[PDB]
Each structure stands twice: as C-alpha cells, then as structure tokens.
Amino acid sequence: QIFGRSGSKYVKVQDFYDQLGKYVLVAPGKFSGTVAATDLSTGWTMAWLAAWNYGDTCPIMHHMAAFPSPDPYKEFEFVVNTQGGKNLFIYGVPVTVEDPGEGMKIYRIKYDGTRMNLQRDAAEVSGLGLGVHVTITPEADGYAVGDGQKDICAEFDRETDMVRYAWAFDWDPNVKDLKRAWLDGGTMTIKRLKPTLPGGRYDLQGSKGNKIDWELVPGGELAIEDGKVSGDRPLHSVANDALVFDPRGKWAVASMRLPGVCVVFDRENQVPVAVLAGPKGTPSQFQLVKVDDDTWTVDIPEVISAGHQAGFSPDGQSFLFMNSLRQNNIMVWDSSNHDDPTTWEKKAVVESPDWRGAYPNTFHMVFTPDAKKIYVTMWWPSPTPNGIAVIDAVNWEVLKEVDLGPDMHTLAITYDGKFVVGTLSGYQNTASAIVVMETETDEVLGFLPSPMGHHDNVIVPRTLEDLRISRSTTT
Amino acid sequence: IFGRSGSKYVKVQDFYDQLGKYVLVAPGKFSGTVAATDLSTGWTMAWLAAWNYGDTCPIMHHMAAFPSPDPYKEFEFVVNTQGGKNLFIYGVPVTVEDPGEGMKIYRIKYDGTRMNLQRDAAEVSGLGLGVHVTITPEADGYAVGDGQKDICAEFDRETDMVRYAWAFDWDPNVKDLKRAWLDGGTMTIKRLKPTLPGGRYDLQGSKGNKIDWELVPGGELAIEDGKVSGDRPLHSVANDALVFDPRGKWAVASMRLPGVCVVFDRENQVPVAVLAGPKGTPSQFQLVKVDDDTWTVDIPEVISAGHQAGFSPDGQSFLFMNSLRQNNIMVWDSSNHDDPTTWEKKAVVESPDWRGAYPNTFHMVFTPDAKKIYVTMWWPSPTPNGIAVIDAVNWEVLKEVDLGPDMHTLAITYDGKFVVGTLSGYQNTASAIVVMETETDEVLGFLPSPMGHHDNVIVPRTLEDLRISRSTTT
Numbered sequence: 001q002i003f004g005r006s007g008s009k010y011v012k013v014q015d016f017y018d019q020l021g022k023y024v025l026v027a028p029g030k031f032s033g034t035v036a037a038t039d040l041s042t043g044w045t046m047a048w049l050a051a052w053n054y055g056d057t058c059p060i061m062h063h064m065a066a067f068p069s070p071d072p073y074k075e076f077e078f079v080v081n082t083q084g085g086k087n088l089f090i091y092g093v094p095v096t097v098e099d100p101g102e103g104m105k106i107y108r109i110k111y112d113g114t115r116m117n118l119q120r121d122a123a124e125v126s127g128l129g130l131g132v133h134v135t136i137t138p139e140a141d142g143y144a145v146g147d148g149q150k151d152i153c154a155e156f157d158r159e160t161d162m163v164r165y166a167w168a169f170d171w172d173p174n175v176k177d178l179k180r181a182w183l184d185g186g187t188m189t190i191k192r193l194k195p196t197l198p199g200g201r202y203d204l205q206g207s208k209g210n211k212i213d214w215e216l217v218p219g220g221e222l223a224i225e226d227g228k229v230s231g232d233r234p235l236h237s238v239a240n241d242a243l244v245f246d247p248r249g250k251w252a253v254a255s256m257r258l259p260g261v262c263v264v265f266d267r268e269n270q271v272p273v274a275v276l277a278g279p280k281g282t283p284s285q286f287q288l289v290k291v292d293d294d295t296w297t298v299d300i301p302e303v304i305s306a307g308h309q310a311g312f313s314p315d316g317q318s319f320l321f322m323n324s325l326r327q328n329n330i331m332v333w334d335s336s337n338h339d340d341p342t343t344w345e346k347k348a349v350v351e352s353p354d355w356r357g358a359y360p361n362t363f364h365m366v367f368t369p370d371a372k373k374i375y376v377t378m379w380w381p382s383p384t385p386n387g388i389a390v391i392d393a394v395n396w397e398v399l400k401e402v403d404l405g406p407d408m409h410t411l412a413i414t415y416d417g418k419f420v421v422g423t424l425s426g427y428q429n430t431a432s433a434i435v436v437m438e439t440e441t442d443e444v445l446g447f448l449p450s451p452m453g454h455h456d457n458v459i460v461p462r463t464l465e466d467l468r469i470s471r472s473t474t475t
Numbered sequence: 476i477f478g479r480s481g482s483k484y485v486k487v488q489d490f491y492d493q494l495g496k497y498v499l500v501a502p503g504k505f506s507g508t509v510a511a512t513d514l515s516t517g518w519t520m521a522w523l524a525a526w527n528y529g530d531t532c533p534i535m536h537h538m539a540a541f542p543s544p545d546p547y548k549e550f551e552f553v554v555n556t557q558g559g560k561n562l563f564i565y566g567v568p569v570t571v572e573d574p575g576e577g578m579k580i581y582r583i584k585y586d587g588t589r590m591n592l593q594r595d596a597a598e599v600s601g602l603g604l605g606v607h608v609t610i611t612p613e614a615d616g617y618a619v620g621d622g623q624k625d626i627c628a629e630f631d632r633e634t635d636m637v638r639y640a641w642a643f644d645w646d647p648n649v650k651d652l653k654r655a656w657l658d659g660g661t662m663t664i665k666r667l668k669p670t671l672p673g674g675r676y677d678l679q680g681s682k683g684n685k686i687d688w689e690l691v692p693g694g695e696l697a698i699e700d701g702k703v704s705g706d707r708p709l710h711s712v713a714n715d716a717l718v719f720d721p722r723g724k725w726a727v728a729s730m731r732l733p734g735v736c737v738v739f740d741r742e743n744q745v746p747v748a749v750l751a752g753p754k755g756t757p758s759q760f761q762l763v764k765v766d767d768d769t770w771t772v773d774i775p776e777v778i779s780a781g782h783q784a785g786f787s788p789d790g791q792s793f794l795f796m797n798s799l800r801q802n803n804i805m806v807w808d809s810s811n812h813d814d815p816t817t818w819e820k821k822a823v824v825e826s827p828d829w830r831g832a833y834p835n836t837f838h839m840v841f842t843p844d845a846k847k848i849y850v851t852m853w854w855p856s857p858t859p860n861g862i863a864v865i866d867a868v869n870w871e872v873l874k875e876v877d878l879g880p881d882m883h884t885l886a887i888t889y890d891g892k893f894v895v896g897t898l899s900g901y902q903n904t905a906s907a908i909v910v911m912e913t914e915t916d917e918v919l920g921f922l923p924s925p926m927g928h929h930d931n932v933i934v935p936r937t938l939e940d941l942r943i944s945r946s947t948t949t
C-alpha cells in the first residue's frame with residue numbers, strides 16, 4: 001500500500017479499477033462531437049476521436065454498438081451514427097450554427113490497439129443515412145440502424161455496409177388533426193424500401209426522407225401533437241426508434257414510438273410476421289394484413305400510449321416494450337416460441353405507483369447474463385434526479401430505485417454480470433458522469449468523470465454470447 | 476457506513492473524499508471541448524464544445540481561472556485557441572480544407588450549472604493570441620502570449636482591453652535558418668500600439684503570424700532545418716508566456732528561440748531586464764533603450780533554447796528551463812523586488828537522464844511553501860513520459876515517476892496535498908487525469924479524460940491560491 005508518516009494509508013483509485021475486471025467501455029458524446037473508449041481496469045481513456053477533425057460540420061455523435069472482439073485491447077470495430085439539422089437546436093445550448101450539416105452519418109470506426117481509425121461513412125457507401133439506434137446482429141455479421149425522422153430501419157452487411165433490407169413505415173391517422181392523430185387510431189403501412197440508385201444504393205443521405213425536423217425527445221409525442229414539431233409530414237410520423245435482434249437469430253423487432261407497437265420481421269425472408277401491441281389493455285397483437293409483395297398494413301383502433309424501449313432477454317424467452325408518458329410501465333411477452341412470433345403472448349406488466357406521473361421514462365435497460373435481473377433507467381427533465389430501477393425479471397417486480405443526478409441515459413453490464421456501467425449526460429450543458437453499480441446487492445459504487453453528452457454506451461464484448469446483454473438485444 | 480455487502484466492494488467515492496472540495500478545469504486541444512470536474516465526487520460539472528458556437532478550428536489551448544470564493548457556485552476563466560496549420564501537426568489524419576484561423580480568446584463563466592460563453596476577447600480587443608494564458612496576481616486582468624506572432628499582452632478583466640502589448644523581433648547575425656540562433660543576433664522589444672477605432676488592434680486570427688504553427692517541443696530544430704513554413708521565420712523568437720511575480724509589479728515574458736526572459740515593469744510599461752537562459756552565460760544580458768517605445772538586447776550566441784518559466788510562490792526564485800541543447804533548470808535569486816537588474820543566477824538543477832532534447836520539462840508547479848516543485852517530463856511516442864519532483868531548497872531532483880504517453884500540465888490542490896495533471900495521447904491515443912499525493916510523492920492512479928489537454932488548473936479561492944496556479948508558472 002501507500003502509507004502516510006502517521007501509518008494511515010492513502011486510497012489508490014487503482015484499487016477501485018482492480019475489482020472491475022478487464023473491460024473496455026465506449027461511449028459517444030452527443031454535442032461534445034467526440035467518441036471515447038475507456039479501460040475500466042486502469043481509468044485511462046484508451047483513445048478518443050473528434051469528428052470535427054474529419055470535416056464533420058454537425059458531429060452530434062449519437063448511438064453506437066461494438067462488434068465482439070477476442071481481445072478488445074488489441075482491436076475492436078464499432079458503429080456510431082450522428083444527427084444533424086434542427087437536432088442541433090433542441091437542447092439547452094444556445095448554439096449559433098444556424099445552418100448546420102445534415103448528419104445521419106453512420107461511421108465505421110476501428111480501434112487498433114492504439115488509436116481510433118475512422119474507416120468510412122456507411123451512409124455514403126449505402127446511400128442510407130439513419131440517426132437513431134445502432135445495434136449489432138446476433139451473428140456479428142452486421143448491424144442495424146433505426147430513424148424516427150424518416151421512419152426507416154435497416155440491417156446492413158458488416159463487410160460491405162450494404163443494406164440487406166430496409167423497411168419504411170408510414171402513418172394514416174383516423175383523424176388528421178395533430179392533436180388526435182394518434183389517440184384516435186389509424187393505420188400504419190410497412191413498405192419494403194428498394195435502392196433507387198446505381199450500385200444498389202439509396203438516395204436517403206442526410207435529411208432526405210425526413211418527415212419531421214428532429215427526433216422526438218422523451219414525452220415529445222405531446223409536442224408533435226401540439227404542433228411544436230416542424231417538418232413536411234408530421235401526421236405521417238410513427239417515430240421508429242430501433243431494430244433490436246432476437247438473440248436466437250432469425251427475428252428482428254422494429255419499435256415504433258408514436259403508434260405504440262413493435263413489428264417482428266423475418267430477417268432471412270425479409271417480410272414482417274407480427275405486430276405486438278404496447279399499451280396495457282390491448283391484445284397481445286394487432287392484425288398484420290398483406291397488401292402486395294412489398295406492402296403490409298396494420299390498423300390500430302386507438303393509441304392508448306406511446307412506447308419506446310424494446311428488447312429481448314439474453315435467452316430469447318421474453319420480449320419487453322416500455323409504455324411511456326401516458327402509461328409508464330414494462331409490457332412483457334412470452335417469446336419462447338422461436339418458430340412462430342404470431343404465437344407470442346403477453347404474460348406480465350411491470351408497474352409501479354411511482355410511475356403515476358408523465359415521468360419517469362424508462363428508456364434503456366440491460367439484463368444480467370442469467371436473465372434474472374434487469375437494470376432500467378429512470379429519466380426526468382431537469383431538475384428531478386434521474387436514476388436506475390432494478391427489476392426482478394423472474395417475478396416481474398421492481399426490486400429497488402436509486403437516485404443519481406441529472407439526465408440518465410444508457411446502461412451496459414460487465415459480461416460476467418458483476419457491474420452495471422451507465423452514463424449521465426447533463427442535458428448537454430450540465431453535470432455528466434459514468435456511474436458504476438454492483439449487481440450483487442445493488443449498491444452504487446460511485447462516479448467517474450465523462451465530459452460528454454452520451455446517448456449510448458457499450459462494453460466491448462468478447463463473444464457472440466456476450467452480445468446477448470450488449471447493444472444487440474436491447475437499447 | 477456499510478451496506479449489505481459490508482466491505483466487499485471498493486467505493487470510488489472513498490478516493491474522492493480524501494482529495495477535498497477542489498474543481499479541476501481543462502481544455503481539450505483537438506477534442507474541441509473544455510471541462511470542469513469535481514474532484515470530490517468524480518462528476519464532470521459542465522463541459523462546452525466550441526463547434527456549437529461556430530468555431531471552425533476549435534483547438535482549445537491554454538487557460539487560467541480567476542479566483543472565486545466558491546467555485547461550486549460560480550467561477551470565471553479564460554481559454555484561447557489555435558488554428559490554421561496547427562491543425563496538421565499531430566498524428567490525426569485530418570480532412571479539413573480551409574480550417575478556421577483560431578487565436579480566439581474566449582471568456583467563459585460557470586454559473587453553478589453550466590458553462591456560458593461570454594465573448595471572444597480577441598474580437599473585443601482586436602488582438603488574437605494562441606499560446607499561454609495567465610491571470611494577474613491581483614486577479615483584475617489576465618495575459619496571453621503567442622509564438623507565431625511573437626506578441627504578449629496583459630488585458631483588463633472588465634473591459635477585455637489591452638493594458639499593454641509587447642512585440643519581439645529577431646535580428647540574426649547569420650541569415651541562415653541553420654545558424655540564425657546558434658550564431659546569435661539582436662532581439663527587439665517594441666511597444667505594440669493599436670491601429671483601429673476605439674484603440675483596437677488589427678491582429679485577430681492569423682494576422683501577425685511569422686510562422687504557420689507554434690513550435691513543437693524540440694521544434695526549434697525543425698525551424699532551423701526550414702521545415703517550418705511561414706513568411707518570416709528568420710525573425711522568430713517564439714514568445715511562450717507572460718508570467719507574473721506574485722509580489723506584483725513585474726511580469727516576465729519567456730522567449731523560446733533566443734533563450735531569454737524579459738522582465739517588464741507592468742504599471743510603467745517598460746522592460747527592465749533580460750535574463751540569460753543557458754548555463755555558461757552571465758546572469759543577464761544588457762538592456763539597450765533606443766527610444767521611448769523600443770529596446771534591444773544583444774545575444775552573441777544562443778547556447779540553448781529555453782521554455783518553462785516562472786516564479787516560486789513567495790517570489791524568491793525565478794526559473795527558466797533550458798530545453799533543447801542543454802536540459803536543466805536555470806534558477807535566479809529574485810528576492811530583490813525593487814530592482815530586477817540585480818537578479819543573479821543561483822543554481823542549475825541537473826539530471827543524468829536529462830540530455831537534449833528529451834525529456835522536455837515544459838510545465839511545472841510548486842508546493843505552497845515553495846519547498847518542492849513538480850515538473851513534467853515529455854517525450855515523443857513511444858517513450859514513457861512522467862513527472863520529476865524537485866527539491867526547491869537544495870535545487871536537486873528528488874524523484875522521477877513514469878506514467879504514460881504525452882504528459883502535459885500539472886496543477887496542485889491549494890492545501891499542498893495532491894498534484895493533478897493531464898496526459899493527452901498525442902491527440903490520438905491514451906489520455907487521462909493523474910493524481911499524485913505530495914507527502915510521499917506516489918501516484919494514486921488515473922481518472923478518465925477523453926481530451927487532449929495542453930493545460931489544466933484547479934480553480935483558486937483567494938489571491939494567495941493564485942501563486943501556485945496559472946499566474947506564476949505555466
């Protein structure tokens with residue numbers, strides 16, 4: 001140890017890192033314009049990258065996901081997207097760039113044991129730019145991006161960065177009044193999106209395709225209803241969030257925020273197979289109707305609540321969709337039947353008197369490796385302290401809530417199940433940190449500095465199995 | 476005291492509890508950001524990204540913080556930037572054509588929640604300067620130096636207007652970049668007066684530049700080999716900083732290339748002494764007054780470039796590192812506050828591992844009782860950079876610790892207990908905050924810092940604190 005003259009020992013922070021293991025945390029920084037990998041075994045930032053260095057004129061570094069690497073310390077690859085345009089104006093920061101870049105870039109970056117290397121922009125390769133959740137396929141042979149301004153999600157080939165398939169979603173509201181457009185129901189169309197360009201390419205880079213000028217914020221479903229969200233076709237919006245993956249392969253689920261549904265897709269045969277109904281009180285599913293070989297519809301009598309967070313248990317047994325704002329809860333499906341998602345039926349709802357209000361919103365989660373516990377974020381607007389709720393995933397009950405500080409975002413877990421590692425991001429202008437909480441008795445062990453506005457974080461997985469509790473099955 | 480797991484798990488909050496209630500602030504160089512960090516909780520308190528404010532080459536560079544009675548409620552600070560071809564000088568494969576010109580001097584106020592960009596004092600005064608930033612010992616102003624333009628100036632805190640500016644020019648004996656300094660020359664020290672309405676300078680951005688980028692450590696060899704582009708490289712002296720004597724009255728401008736520091740009378744606006752850097756030269760060179768606005772000093776040969784420069788917190792010693800051809804710490808007796816002409820060379824700190832070149836000792840900080848100094852040791856990749864502990868009574872190296880790549884600045888908590896510095900991955904690799912306890916001079920470890928920091932401070936509370944902050948040394 002290190003002793004004073006008094007024989008009292010100094011605290012070495014290295015002692016704190018010793019216990020965490022050999023794990024590499026990565027996180028983008030939103031308005032900071034940077035992305036950073038951290039060695040949780042030493043406290044060092046291993047390498048960071050500033051997209052402005054590459055001529056990016058709106059480097060709002062947004063979602064990300066890391067491919068497994070046998071040894072992350074020697075190398076790993078990862079995907080990180082950006083947003084642009086009026087997403088720049090939506091936080092508490094008096095930005096002065098009135099005409100910023102359009103974003104929707106999808107960067108491929110490789111850490112090489114020393115530095116980050118920006119490989120290319122896959123949105124340029126494919127011509128498809130998408131700016132919300134990034135996930136890796138369970139096979140680690142590609143990745144997926146959702147976007148809630150264009151309402152397009154797509155799975156991409158890891159090697160080529162070419163779109164394997166893309167789905168576009170559209171809203172036909174029963175009542176063409178923004179106030180009632182979702183409440184009073186409507187019909188959502190699912191359309192196969194095909195390349196319109198030479199070389200198998202799309203012509204949907206940057207803001208091409210945008211229905212609204214920014215991604216809705218938490219509870220922003222109120223704001224688009226209230227006419228506060230500008231764009232060409234807000235009545236047509238469904239706010240696609242993510243395409244998450246069944247860890248057993250075959251199925252991918254696209255979350256649609258405004259109509260409160262998730263669409264299960266056959267990855268191989270590239271068709272939709274089921275629509276899951278979010279709000280408590282609705283059946284397990286809504287009816288999928290084929291119109292033609294490229295087009296399907298689903299009618300929703302009414303939208304009781306918006307939904308947001310979506311994903312699978314590591315064993316593929318359960319599927320989860322969070323209702324948010326008008327109901328705050330966790331809706332749970334039995335997805336044990338890997339053969340037929342039309343059989344998936346609701347089996348539980350995690351609820352709490354504490355979720356009475358319009359907040360908190362439960363918009364990120366991570367499961368323990370053994371699928372018995374979930375850690376779920378609790379977000380509020382300033383100044384309410386944000387935190388984590390620990391969920392019993394066997395009985396479907398809230399074990400515990402802890403307060404942390406402002407603007408809680410994502411949660412990752414060391415692959416041995418021992419430590420949850422999360423990010424708080426200051427609403428882009430105030431306090432921000434990495435938080436560490438041990439999963440045995442669920443005690444917060446403290447904070448590490450992180451001067452970034454993280455809307456995502458991952459721990460680099462070693463294996464296909466690690467990926468089941470990484471940015472692949474949940475967001 | 477304990478939860479359910481008893482003492483099973485290490486809480487990082489213990490680590491911070493011993494550090495006390497101090498706020499670390501640092502700029503991020505290529506990160507384009509600047510950040511304040513609470514050493515008592517491990518939170519970043521606030522961060523600011525200059526690209527948000529239309530900055531197109533946001534190389535956030537040096538900074539200094541004004542004292543505040545409670546830095547957790549509010550504090551003010553000054554951070555400048557670099558631009559043009561300073562963008563192209565590190566390992567990053569940048570793809571920016573027509574980068575911003577930089578040399579902005581941002582005023583930023585932390586208001587207990589957020590950072591607020593107040594203005595660019597370079598736009599206010601018309602004078603942009605891209606190297607060291609310091610606070611006056613009275614905290615009523617600040618100063619900035621520049622080694623591309625060879626200008627330094629002290630500014631009023633309220634108005635952001637120049638109180639005085641100095642321009643420095645080299646007349647080399649031999650008109651050959653190879654010999655322009657080895658073979659000596661005359662350096663001119665000239666009052667710099669404004670040209671524009673309202674007493675404004677016409678020197679923003681890259682206006683005034685002799686060379687296209689600030690000299691890297693050991694980079695005086697690059698300018699000699701004429702691998703530094705620019706209009707007037709033979710005229711370069713590479714001013715580094717303007718530091719302050721904590722007792723007041725005097726400020727000292729460090730000149731890298733001709734190996735000297737110039738002492739200036741602040742209030743009367745005259746240079747009063749030239750301190751000669753290399754071991755082997757006299758205590759001073761002779762100051763010659765040509766008219767009320769112009770002085771010259773002759774330097775037969777330049778034995779070595781110098782860099783770090785500063786005062787002990789009581790003002791008793793003044794130091795200038797030799798840092799190219801010699802590698803040592805040159806020390807002067809500056810106890811005579813009345814007259815800088817009397818200041819005499821009193822010691823040279825030497826070490827067997829200091830040959831050249833590297834390590835480059837370009838930052839330092841003292842303990843509050845002036846008994847010890849902490850000195851960076853910089854090397855290019857892949858040599859381990861680290862810290863040197865200096866005995867400031869006997870003038871010898873106590874200890875050297877290895878840390879990691881690319882060591883930059885060092886600050887100290889104001890009770891004397893913890894040195895906090897930054898390492899910066901040459902802007903593309905590993906970076907961190909380092910904490911070292913001063914009692915036995917041992918490294919407590921590192922904290923994450925995804926930034927390229929070329930500066931960092933602990934926000935001072937009082938004028939006394941400022942003596943060991945970014946005021947007396949760099």
Ligand SMILES: [Cu+2]
Nearest residue numbers: 133241308475
């Ligand atoms: Cu989301």
Ligand SMILES: [Cu+2]
Nearest residue numbers: 030062063455
């Ligand atoms: Cu976001």
Ligand SMILES: [Cu+2]
Nearest residue numbers: 715782837949
């Ligand atoms: Cu310097």
Ligand SMILES: [Cu+2]
Nearest residue numbers: 504536537929
């Ligand atoms: Cu620098």
